[PDB]
Amino acid sequence: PKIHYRKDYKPSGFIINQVTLNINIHDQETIVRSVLDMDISKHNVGEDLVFDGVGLKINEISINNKKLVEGEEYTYDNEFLTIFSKFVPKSKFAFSSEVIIHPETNYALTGLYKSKNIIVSQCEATGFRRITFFIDRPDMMAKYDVTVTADKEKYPVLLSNGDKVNEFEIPGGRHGARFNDPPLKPCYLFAVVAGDLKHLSATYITKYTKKKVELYVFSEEKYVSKLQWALECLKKSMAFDEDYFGLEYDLSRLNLVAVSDFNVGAMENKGLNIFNANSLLASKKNSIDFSYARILTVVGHEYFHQYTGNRVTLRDWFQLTLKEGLTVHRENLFSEEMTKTVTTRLSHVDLLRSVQFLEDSSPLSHPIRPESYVSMENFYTTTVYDKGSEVMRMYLTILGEEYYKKGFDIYIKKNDGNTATCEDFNYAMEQAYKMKKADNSANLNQYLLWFSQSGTPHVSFKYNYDAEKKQYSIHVNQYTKPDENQKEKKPLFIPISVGLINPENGKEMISQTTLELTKESDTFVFNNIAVKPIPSLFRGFSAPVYIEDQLTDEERILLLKYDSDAFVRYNSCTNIYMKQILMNYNEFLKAKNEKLESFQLTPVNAQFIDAIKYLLEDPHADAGFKSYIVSLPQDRYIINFVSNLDTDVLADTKEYIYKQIGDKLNDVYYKMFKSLEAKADDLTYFNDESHVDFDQMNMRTLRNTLLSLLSKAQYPNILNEIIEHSKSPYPSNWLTSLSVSAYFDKYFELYDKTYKLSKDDELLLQEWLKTVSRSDRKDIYEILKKLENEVLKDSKNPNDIRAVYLPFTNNLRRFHDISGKGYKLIAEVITKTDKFNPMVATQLCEPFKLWNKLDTKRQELMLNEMNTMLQEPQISNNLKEYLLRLTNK
Ligand SMILES: CC(C)(C)C(=O)N[C@@H](C(=O)NO)c1ccc(-n2cccn2)cc1
Numbered sequence: 001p002k003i004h005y006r007k008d009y010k011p012s013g014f015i016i017n018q019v020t021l022n023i024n025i026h027d028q029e030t031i032v033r034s035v036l037d038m039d040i041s042k043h044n045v046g047e048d049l050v051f052d053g054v055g056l057k058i059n060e061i062s063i064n065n066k067k068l069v070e071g072e073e074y075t076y077d078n079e080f081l082t083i084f085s086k087f088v089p090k091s092k093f094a095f096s097s098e099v100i101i102h103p104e105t106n107y108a109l110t111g112l113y114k115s116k117n118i119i120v121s122q123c124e125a126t127g128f129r130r131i132t133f134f135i136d137r138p139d140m141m142a143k144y145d146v147t148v149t150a151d152k153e154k155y156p157v158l159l160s161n162g163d164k165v166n167e168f169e170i171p172g173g174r175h176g177a178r179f180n181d182p183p184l185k186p187c188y189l190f191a192v193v194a195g196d197l198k199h200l201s202a203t204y205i206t207k208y209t210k211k212k213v214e215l216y217v218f219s220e221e222k223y224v225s226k227l228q229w230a231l232e233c234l235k236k237s238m239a240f241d242e243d244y245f246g247l248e249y250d251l252s253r254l255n256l257v258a259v260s261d262f263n264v265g266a267m268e269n270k271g272l273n274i275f276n277a278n279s280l281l282a283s284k285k286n287s288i289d290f291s292y293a294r295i296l297t298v299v300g301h302e303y304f305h306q307y308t309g310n311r312v313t314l315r316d317w318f319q320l321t322l323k324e325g326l327t328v329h330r331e332n333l334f335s336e337e338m339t340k341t342v343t344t345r346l347s348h349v350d351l352l353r354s355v356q357f358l359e360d361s362s363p364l365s366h367p368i369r370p371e372s373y374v375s376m377e378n379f380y381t382t383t384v385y386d387k388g389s390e391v392m393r394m395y396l397t398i399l400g401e402e403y404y405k406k407g408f409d410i411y412i413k414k415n416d417g418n419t420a421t422c423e424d425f426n427y428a429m430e431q432a433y434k435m436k437k438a439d440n441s442a443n444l445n446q447y448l449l450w451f452s453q454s455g456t457p458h459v460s461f462k463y464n465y466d467a468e469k470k471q472y473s474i475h476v477n478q479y480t481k482p483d484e485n486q487k488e489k490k491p492l493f494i495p496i497s498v499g500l501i502n503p504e505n506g507k508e509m510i511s512q513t514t515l516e517l518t519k520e521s522d523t524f525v526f527n528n529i530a531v532k533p534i535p536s537l538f539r540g541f542s543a544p545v546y547i548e549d550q551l552t553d554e555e556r557i558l559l560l561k562y563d564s565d566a567f568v569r570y571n572s573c574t575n576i577y578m579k580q581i582l583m584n585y586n587e588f589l590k591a592k593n594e595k596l597e598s599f600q601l602t603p604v605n606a607q608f609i610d611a612i613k614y615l616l617e618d619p620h621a622d623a624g625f626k627s628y629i630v631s632l633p634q635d636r637y638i639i640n641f642v643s644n645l646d647t648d649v650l651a652d653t654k655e656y657i658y659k660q661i662g663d664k665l666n667d668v669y670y671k672m673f674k675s676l677e678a679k680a681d682d683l684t685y686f687n688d689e690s691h692v693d694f695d696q697m698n699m700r701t702l703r704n705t706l707l708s709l710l711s712k713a714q715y716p717n718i719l720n721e722i723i724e725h726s727k728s729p730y731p732s733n734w735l736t737s738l739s740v741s742a743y744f745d746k747y748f749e750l751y752d753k754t755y756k757l758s759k760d761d762e763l764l765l766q767e768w769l770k771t772v773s774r775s776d777r778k779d780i781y782e783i784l785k786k787l788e789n790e791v792l793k794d795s796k797n798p799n800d801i802r803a804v805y806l807p808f809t810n811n812l813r814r815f816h817d818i819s820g821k822g823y824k825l826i827a828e829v830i831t832k833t834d835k836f837n838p839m840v841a842t843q844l845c846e847p848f849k850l851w852n853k854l855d856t857k858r859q860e861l862m863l864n865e866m867n868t869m870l871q872e873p874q875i876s877n878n879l880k881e882y883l884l885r886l887t888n889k
């Protein structure tokens, strides 16, 4: 088990200037001929020439056209090719090889592999070494000349990086295409696609240089009609980078390709972007609403990789957050601008405070720039990506738009055509910071702690108001809990976007203000404050922290009703819920522990319920926001606030609170569900694939959320509404009818009905599987077994496997069954999956990430299953390391 350390970075003793590839695809094998035009670097010390090379079958290797022999001149152990230094030349030389690989049986979906009837590659982070020998690290920049050959009937469309410079026929019904890509690039950006691909195309003319750019979106013939939205999103992405950042696309063509078998969302490769089909393809008849925001963000994400990727490459993989955090941040800016709905930002905050906060207090906790790794495939985390983006976002919050866009330009210019680090980015933003403060002594050295320090900071508040002085004070304290990464946590640079709300008319009292907290504690004072304000803190969620506002529920309700900032309204609601949840939880827990025959529960705040009704009945209020306030905080958000969480007791707590609110607002819920129908289910643009209305989709979200609440509560004759819902042409609607019908006898009837609607579309069926998997059924285990035997079977498609099992793991009452049957089931699935796809196996370990936060019995059950998984003789390095770190072993 080798461990790479960030402090151990040293440049290669070798140089690769030119790569010349010949990839010959055949029925039962793929032959890869490679010539590497190499040289000796200034850091060389006469060491052995060591190439990365995993699972390569050597036909022959050479240096300067002379064949090398095994044992005397080189050794190969299926991981590293070692050529002894005495046989390594002193100056410019040519290394060549011919290996055999097998994309057909490559079920790990890394390197070159076959997805249905498409040959496709995935080289990030260390996948290129699975195709041919190379010094597989991102700082090895080279030129690429790639030739691909295959059977024309099976693979008429051949794609790779750069320009297609030659097409030719080959005896035996075969053909070739040659691609030349002159600009330097790292090997993880290499890509190749072969298949019977159909496409939609368009020409984009750039804003400034008026350059014409060919846009292509590819898929298998069956789903070519689902390519339209992707093309529109690409156009949107190009326009946005031109209008906001003032950047145009550098190349003359851009290809997007959908494949059915993909480990993640998508991949950026210079001009050739490859996507999980579920993140590129959609139609209104065959997709749920979520696909449309999903495709927008993922297409945007891969597009925004281009500009920066063309000018600055990572020095090493420890700087991953520099390219991913920044791109997710640009992606988020894009999406917020495109959707023009406040729930877009809210959803990102929702995901961070649930999934990433869990990770950051788990034994897997790490900084966005880690100090070490064993497997790079476990490096791509919500911390690196989503906390990373929040850290990138805070630069904009501190600097403002003008000085941010300015510090961004400094970063590009200063690091053009070379490898950079996170500190290079901080340095550039520091130059903008000095200029903003108009004092050249200003610095952002403390800000670097955001990169090196793990864990989520806690920010708490106390207040004072002097009526006679008209003086208002905000006392702020920050704290980060020590962990395995740092014994002593340092104070961070925390930007606190604030406003002060006049409680008697709801007006803003002060201008836009961002408090800069740089110490463990500070007191911020405001003069000329005519009345006691209600503080609106961390507007837009301006720092990735735990917020302890120390407000009363009455104060929180007034923010919820009258504040101008969506997040603070949403957070105020969240805080009211959390206070109620913790109170009722402890009450239920005491009853259980003391075996009480009778006990009391604290009712939900009546004024809070009044506030919800007020907002729901406001026709000028946002439908998306409304769906958030009638929903309790996510379980994974809640668990960060409870020690030794009894999942049954939490389930009882949620049930009580939902019923409390339902017993008061169910009539309002029903009235709204009916009145929203017209606008939410409007069919005017149902056959226009380029017309996407995010507000309308939010209305459907509200309706489906309300329907769920009404179905659970068994509202009189709601089954009628459920049945009529199933007849809706919108998949979001008729899949909702399935899940909410779980509380009725008509469930298995809609099960069959929605299955027939879903089975002839690959992606739609996967959404059906998800819906079934997440269904609130008492017989969910028998239902899962049915899915395995009748639909899923022995599929190795990651989308299929994730769809069947992951939603079920969110079933608080059932997955966490006290017998451990749920833990045992998922562990069996992880072990089975690990045999062919280690990455997806690790993804399936997701529910275990909170193992040490549960009650003692459930802790023991999960730990038992993880130790059982760890003792599998054939366990992958990926899963092994992941479980070793998670179990603190
Ligand atoms: C959907 C999302 C934006 C999270 C995504 O697909 N991200 C890509 C990415 O950065 N594309 O440019 C991504 C996610 C995980 C990996 N990865 C995970 C393990 C090894 N690589 C690679 C790429």
Ligand SMILES: [Zn+2]
Residues within 6 Å of the ligand: 301, 305, 323, 324, 327
């Ligand atoms: Zn990315």
